[PDB]
Design a protein around this motif. Structure first.
Motif, PDB file in Angstrom:
ATOM      1  N   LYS A  45      -9.844  -0.574  -0.599  1.00 23.22           N
ATOM      2  CA  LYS A  45     -11.050  -0.351   0.230  1.00 23.22           C
ATOM      3  C   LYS A  45     -11.539   1.072  -0.061  1.00 23.22           C
ATOM      4  CE  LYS A  45     -12.930  -0.975   4.907  1.00 23.22           C
ATOM      5  NZ  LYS A  45     -12.709  -1.671   6.192  1.00 23.22           N
ATOM      6  N   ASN A  78     -14.773   4.207   0.327  1.00 22.16           N
ATOM      7  CA  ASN A  78     -15.888   4.817   1.077  1.00 22.16           C
ATOM      8  C   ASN A  78     -16.781   5.593   0.099  1.00 22.16           C
ATOM      9  OD1 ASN A  78     -17.645   6.193   2.688  1.00 22.16           O
ATOM     10  ND2 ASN A  78     -16.126   7.144   3.986  1.00 22.16           N
ATOM     11  N   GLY A 107     -20.229   5.834   2.960  1.00 19.98           N
ATOM     12  CA  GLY A 107     -20.264   5.032   4.200  1.00 19.98           C
ATOM     13  C   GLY A 107     -20.647   3.581   3.976  1.00 19.98           C
ATOM     14  N   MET A 145     -19.212   0.538   2.810  1.00 20.90           N
ATOM     15  CA  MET A 145     -17.779   0.228   2.544  1.00 20.90           C
ATOM     16  C   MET A 145     -17.678  -0.880   1.498  1.00 20.90           C
ATOM     17  SD  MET A 145     -16.527   2.531   4.212  1.00 20.90           S
ATOM     18  CE  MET A 145     -14.743   2.367   4.125  1.00 20.90           C
ATOM     19  N   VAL A 162     -10.434  -7.618   6.756  1.00 21.61           N
ATOM     20  CA  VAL A 162     -10.380  -6.204   6.281  1.00 21.61           C
ATOM     21  C   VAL A 162     -11.704  -5.509   6.623  1.00 21.61           C
ATOM     22  CG1 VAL A 162     -10.014  -4.678   4.334  1.00 21.61           C
ATOM     23  CG2 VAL A 162      -8.687  -6.763   4.518  1.00 21.61           C
ATOM     24  N   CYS A 163     -12.778  -6.244   6.416  1.00 24.92           N
ATOM     25  CA  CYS A 163     -14.176  -5.864   6.715  1.00 24.92           C
ATOM     26  C   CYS A 163     -14.757  -4.878   5.688  1.00 24.92           C
ATOM     27  CB  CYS A 163     -14.333  -5.405   8.155  1.00 24.92           C
ATOM     28  SG  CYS A 163     -16.028  -4.990   8.558  1.00 24.92           S
ATOM     29  N   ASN A 218     -25.804   2.686   5.993  1.00 20.76           N
ATOM     30  CA  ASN A 218     -25.262   4.077   6.036  1.00 20.76           C
ATOM     31  C   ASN A 218     -25.739   4.835   4.797  1.00 20.76           C
ATOM     32  OD1 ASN A 218     -23.947   3.941   8.439  1.00 20.76           O
ATOM     33  ND2 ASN A 218     -22.019   3.208   7.531  1.00 20.76           N
ATOM     34  N   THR A 236     -10.891   6.574  -1.782  1.00 21.76           N
ATOM     35  CA  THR A 236     -10.062   5.384  -1.472  1.00 21.76           C
ATOM     36  C   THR A 236      -9.551   5.526  -0.037  1.00 21.76           C
ATOM     37  OG1 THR A 236      -9.480   5.378  -3.758  1.00 21.76           O
ATOM     38  CG2 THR A 236      -8.233   3.882  -2.332  1.00 21.76           C
ATOM     39  N   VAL A 237      -9.781   4.528   0.811  1.00 17.79           N
ATOM     40  CA  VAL A 237      -9.302   4.585   2.224  1.00 17.79           C
ATOM     41  C   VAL A 237      -8.030   3.757   2.370  1.00 17.79           C
ATOM     42  CG1 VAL A 237     -11.625   5.052   3.046  1.00 17.79           C
ATOM     43  CG2 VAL A 237     -10.690   2.721   3.224  1.00 17.79           C
ATOM     44  N   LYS A 245      -2.885  -4.651   9.472  1.00 17.15           N
ATOM     45  CA  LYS A 245      -4.091  -4.969  10.272  1.00 17.15           C
ATOM     46  C   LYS A 245      -3.927  -6.405  10.782  1.00 17.15           C
ATOM     47  CE  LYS A 245      -9.158  -4.618  10.284  1.00 17.15           C
ATOM     48  NZ  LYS A 245     -10.304  -3.958   9.623  1.00 17.15           N
ATOM     49  N   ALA A 269     -15.281   3.183  11.292  1.00 11.63           N
ATOM     50  CA  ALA A 269     -15.966   2.103  10.547  1.00 11.63           C
ATOM     51  C   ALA A 269     -16.033   2.430   9.052  1.00 11.63           C
ATOM     52  CB  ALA A 269     -17.339   1.881  11.115  1.00 11.63           C
ATOM     53  N   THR A 270     -15.900   3.711   8.741  1.00 10.25           N
ATOM     54  CA  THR A 270     -15.915   4.199   7.344  1.00 10.25           C
ATOM     55  C   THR A 270     -14.474   4.336   6.836  1.00 10.25           C
ATOM     56  OG1 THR A 270     -16.231   6.411   8.153  1.00 10.25           O
ATOM     57  CG2 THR A 270     -18.222   5.184   7.523  1.00 10.25           C
ATOM     58  N   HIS A 271     -13.541   3.681   7.517  1.00  9.35           N
ATOM     59  CA  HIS A 271     -12.121   3.699   7.102  1.00  9.35           C
ATOM     60  C   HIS A 271     -11.574   2.267   7.216  1.00  9.35           C
ATOM     61  CE1 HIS A 271      -8.212   5.508   6.197  1.00  9.35           C
ATOM     62  NE2 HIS A 271      -8.884   6.537   5.786  1.00  9.35           N
ATOM     63  N   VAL A 272     -10.299   2.079   7.520  1.00 12.84           N
ATOM     64  CA  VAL A 272      -9.763   0.688   7.597  1.00 12.84           C
ATOM     65  C   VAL A 272     -10.535  -0.090   8.670  1.00 12.84           C
ATOM     66  CG1 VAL A 272      -7.740  -0.744   7.931  1.00 12.84           C
ATOM     67  CG2 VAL A 272      -7.528   1.401   6.709  1.00 12.84           C
ATOM     68  N   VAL A 298      -3.893  -9.790   8.701  1.00 14.32           N
ATOM     69  CA  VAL A 298      -5.021  -9.873   7.725  1.00 14.32           C
ATOM     70  C   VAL A 298      -4.727  -8.984   6.522  1.00 14.32           C
ATOM     71  CG1 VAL A 298      -6.623 -10.494   9.553  1.00 14.32           C
ATOM     72  CG2 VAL A 298      -6.565  -8.124   8.705  1.00 14.32           C
ATOM     73  N   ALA A 299      -3.958  -7.920   6.701  1.00 13.59           N
ATOM     74  CA  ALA A 299      -3.695  -6.973   5.607  1.00 13.59           C
ATOM     75  C   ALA A 299      -2.492  -6.098   5.898  1.00 13.59           C
ATOM     76  CB  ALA A 299      -4.925  -6.134   5.337  1.00 13.59           C
ATOM     77  N   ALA A 318      -2.826   3.397   3.842  1.00 11.46           N
ATOM     78  CA  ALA A 318      -4.103   4.041   4.185  1.00 11.46           C
ATOM     79  C   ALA A 318      -3.973   5.544   3.900  1.00 11.46           C
ATOM     80  CB  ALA A 318      -4.459   3.747   5.616  1.00 11.46           C
ATOM     81  N   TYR A 319      -5.081   6.155   3.497  1.00  6.92           N
ATOM     82  CA  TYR A 319      -5.163   7.569   3.051  1.00  6.92           C
ATOM     83  C   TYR A 319      -6.058   8.323   4.030  1.00  6.92           C
ATOM     84  CZ  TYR A 319      -3.294   5.151  -0.943  1.00  6.92           C
ATOM     85  OH  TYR A 319      -2.530   4.374  -1.775  1.00  6.92           O
TER      86      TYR A 319
END
Ligand SMILES: [Cl-]
Ligand SMILES: [Cl-]
Ligand SMILES: [Cl-]
Ligand SMILES: [Cl-]
Ligand SMILES: [Cl-]
Ligand SMILES: [Cl-]
Ligand SMILES: [Cs+]
Ligand SMILES: [Cs+]
Ligand SMILES: [Cs+]
Ligand SMILES: [Cs+]
Ligand SMILES: [Cs+]
Ligand SMILES: [Cs+]
Ligand SMILES: [Cs+]
Ligand SMILES: [Cs+]
Ligand SMILES: [Cs+]
Ligand SMILES: [Cs+]
Ligand SMILES: [Cs+]
Ligand SMILES: [Cs+]
Ligand SMILES: [Cs+]
Ligand SMILES: [Cs+]
Lengths: 263, 263
Positions: free
Chosen positions: A7, A9, A12, A14, A40-41, A200, A255-256, B7, B37-40, B256-257, B261-262
Motif C-alpha cells: 500500500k 501514499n 494522499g 492511496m 485493505v481499502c 486528495n 510505502t505505508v 487488519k 486514511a492516508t495510511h493502513v 483482511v490483511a 506497516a511503516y
C-alpha cells in the motif's frame, strides 16, 4: 485466496500494488475486494506482471500515481539506481517513459493532451474562463479561481451533474486552480456511474496544469509545484512544435504497508 | 519504525491489532498514524502486550469489536480450541469474560449498564419515546423507529449537536432501532471533539439493544440478531437480580490483511 500486496501514499491518492501472480480474468474481482472500505481499502489497484516492467491496472486504464508507486517499488525493493527507463502500462499503445531521480523523486510521462479550447462556463450568477483540455479517453477543464470555496465546489458539482458528456470521456475533471497559491482542488466525475470525488491529489490533473501553463504563457514549465489537498506534485510540460504537448509529473511516494491480503 | 499488524473486519467496523512490542508511551502516536486514511486506515487500534492475554487500546478505553478481533486472532493464529476464558483489556477493572464458540463465533462480555431511564426526546415537530442507558463512561439512547430515514438522521444529528452532555460521557450514542426488522442505525457523538459518525456497526450499541429488550419485555434475550449497515451482531442480555444487567455480544470476524506497516 492470498494476495501479496503493498500500500502506498503518493500525495494522499492511496494505491495498492499486487506482487503475487493471478489470471488477468481475476484482476477486476481481486481489485474490487481490495479497494473496499471494509478491506485493505484504496483508490486504485495495479498488478505487477528483458521487457521486464509491466503494470496492469484493474480497469486496464493508465494511472500516473500507480505508475509512480510502481517506480518507487522498483527503487525501494529492487534497488534500481537513478536512471531513465520505460515501463509497459495498461491503457498505453507505447511504453511509458519513467525516471528515478535523486532524493527519491519519480517522473512519469503523462498522456498527450490532443487539443485545448478556451471556453467560459456558467455556474449560478457567474461565468468563469476555463481551458478545456481534451485527451483520447478523458477531458479536464482548468478553471482559474481567486480562492477555492465550498460555494464554488457546490456550483462545480451541479455543473458536472447537469451537463451531457461525450461517451469518449471515461472521466470529466474539473480542476479548480488558484494560480497565485499554485493550488489545485481536483474534482473527478465518472459519467457512466454518475459519481463525483474531490481527490486528495490528481496526477492527471497535475499534468493538465502543465498544459494550461504552456497555453497561458507560451513558456515551457519545469518542476512547477502543484499544491493539492494530499500534498504536492511537480509538472514539466512543453509544446514541441508538430509533436504537440509533452508532459510529465514528478513526485515522492511513501510505502505505508506490505504483506498478505485475504479475499 | 516497522509495526507488525493485522487488519480485521468485525461487521464493517475496521480494527487493527499490533503484534510487535512498543513502549505504551508510543501507542497514541503509532495508532494515530495507522488509523489515518492516508495510511493502513481503521477505526480502532489495539496493542497485543500465565495471565497471557492482554489487549491495550490506543485511547485506553474498552472496545468490544477490538476484543472480538483479538479473540479471532487467538483462534486463527494460536489455534485455541472452543473454550471460555478471560482477557485483560484496557478500560476494565476486572478481566473480561470471552469465549470461542463453534462456527468461529466469538463472545465478549460488555460493560454493565448502571441504570435506564425511559424518556421522550423532541426533534422537530415530533416526540419519540427513548430509553436512556447509562454506563460508567458513556450514554446510549435507544430510539425505536418505524423505519430509519435521512430526515430522522438529520434530526438526530441536530439533537446531539444542540444538547449539553455530562463530561462523564466520553461518547453519546443515538441507537435508532427498527424493532420489527431488528435493524440498528447507530450514531456516535464525541462531545469533546464535537464529531459524529454513523458507524457501519456498534458492539456497544448492540449491547444496548440487549438491555433495551430486557427492560421492554422483562425477558432475557439469547443470540438476539441485531442487523446493522456493516453486517449483524448477536446480543445475549439478562437482568440478574441485585447483580444487575449481564450483557455479551457474539459475532464473526474476518482477517483482511497481515504484514508490516511503516510509520
Ligand atoms: Cl482465466
Ligand atoms: Cl462533452
Ligand atoms: Cl451515484
Ligand atoms: Cl517511554
Ligand atoms: Cl447528559
Ligand atoms: Cl467537528
Ligand atoms: Cs493465464
Ligand atoms: Cs475505496
Ligand atoms: Cs451528467
Ligand atoms: Cs458537455
Ligand atoms: Cs485519467
Ligand atoms: Cs520551477
Ligand atoms: Cs519547484
Ligand atoms: Cs517500557
Ligand atoms: Cs480513519
Ligand atoms: Cs454539543
Ligand atoms: Cs443532555
Ligand atoms: Cs463505548
Ligand atoms: Cs434468538
Ligand atoms: Cs438468532
Amino acid at each position: 485466496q492470498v494476495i501479496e500486496f503493498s500500500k502506498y501514499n503518493p500525495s494522499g491518492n492511496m494505491t495498492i500494488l499486487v506482487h503475487s501472480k493471478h489470471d488477468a480474468s481475476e484482476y477486476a474481482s481481486i481489485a474490487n475486494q481490495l479497494m473496499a472500505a471494509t478491506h485493505v481499502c484504496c483508490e486504485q489497484v495495479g498488478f505487477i506482471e528483458g521487457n521486464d516492467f509491466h503494470l496492469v491496472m484493474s480497469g486496464n486504464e493508465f494511472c500516473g500515481n500507480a505508475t509512480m508507486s510502481y517506480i518507487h517499488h522498483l527503487q525501494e525493493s529492487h534497488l534500481l539506481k537513478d536512471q531513465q527507463f520505460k515501463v509497459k502500462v495498461s491503457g498505453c499503445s507505447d511504453l511509458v517513459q519513467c525516471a528515478i531521480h535523486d532524493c527519491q523523486y519519480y517522473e512519469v510521462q503523462m498522456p498527450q493532451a490532443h487539443r485545448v479550447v478556451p471556453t467560459t462556463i456558467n455556474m449560478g450568477n457567474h461565468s468563469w474562463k476555463a481551458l478545456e483540455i481534451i485527451y483520447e479517453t478523458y477531458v479536464h477543464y482548468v478553471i482559474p479561481v481567486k480562492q477555492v470555496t465550498t460555494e464554488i465546489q457546490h456550483l462545480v458539482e451541479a455543473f458536472v451533474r447537469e451537463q451531457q458528456w461525450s461517451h469518449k470521456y471515461k472521466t470529466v475533471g474539473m480542476m479548480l486552480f488558484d494560480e497565485q497559491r499554485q493550488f489545485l482542488q481536483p474534482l473527478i466525475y465518472i459519467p457512466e456511474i454518475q459519481s463525483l470525488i474531490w481527490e486528495n491529489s490528481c496526477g492527471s490533473g497535475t499534468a493538465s496544469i502543465g498544459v494550461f501553463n504552456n497555453y497561458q504563457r507560451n513558456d515551457a514549465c519545469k518542476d512547477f509545484t502543484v499544491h493539492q489537498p494530499g500534498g504536492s506534485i511537480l509538472v514539466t510540460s512543453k509544446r514541441c512544435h508538430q509533436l504537440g504537448y509533452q508532459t510529465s509529473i514528478k513526485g515522492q511516494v511513501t510505502t505505508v504497508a506490505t504483506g498478505k491480503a485475504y479475499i
